[PDB]
Amino acid sequence: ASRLYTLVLVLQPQRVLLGMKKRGFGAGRWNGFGGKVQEGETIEDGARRELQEESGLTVDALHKVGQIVFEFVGEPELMDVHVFCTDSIQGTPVESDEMRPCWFQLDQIPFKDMWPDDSYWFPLLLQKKKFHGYFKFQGQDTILDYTLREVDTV
Numbered sequence: 001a002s003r004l005y006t007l008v009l010v011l012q013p014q015r016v017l018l019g020m021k022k023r024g025f026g027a028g029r030w031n032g033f034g035g036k037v038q039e040g041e042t043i044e045d046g047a048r049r050e051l052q053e054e055s056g057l058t059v060d061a062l063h064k065v066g067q068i069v070f071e072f073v074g075e076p077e078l079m080d081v082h083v084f085c086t087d088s089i090q091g092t093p094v095e096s097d098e099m100r101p102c103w104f105q106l107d108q109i110p111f112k113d114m115w116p117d118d119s120y121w122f123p124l125l126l127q128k129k130k131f132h133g134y135f136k137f138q139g140q141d142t143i144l145d146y147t148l149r150e151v152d153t154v
């Protein structure tokens with residue numbers, strides 16, 4: 001059994017939009033925008049909601065780019081993250097209670113201050129290849145196992 005999560009990456013030709021998480025799960029790490037999927041909304045609905053809540057931004061189209069399943073040692077529920085990207089956004093990203101947004105050149109992505117799995121799967125995101133990932137964490141910082149694959153359908 002897994003819990004659904006969203007992750008939205010605004011990936012333009014020369015830069016990626018990330019947010020510094022100010023509170024809650026993942027505070028202190030840069031990441032794309034997302035969170036738990038609620039009862040009563042589609043996964044993509046929840047993705048749009050978390051983008052708007054955390055950055056003020058809305059988008060015309062979201063594209064499925066990946067799925068990553070996480071196991072945490074001693075935690076019974078797996079976490080199922082659905083990753084989306086978009087290239088065009090509506091509005092200017094602005095700070096919220098959860099996230100401080102900044103653009104990053106693609107050669108200056110802050111991997112040391114991101115989730116450790118990002119350094120593994122971000123290359124596939126940037127080559128615009130669809131992927132399935134699996135990571136076993138011990139705590140929040142230690143990857144014990146992982147698998148990573150490109151897929152034809154996310």
Ligand SMILES: Nc1nc(NC2CC2)cc(N2CCCCC2)n1
Binds near residue numbers: 034081140
């Ligand atoms: N890039 C990223 N890496 C993750 N690794 C898991 C914690 C060890 C989770 C995650 N998200 C889950 C919470 C919402 C935002 C997306 N996003």
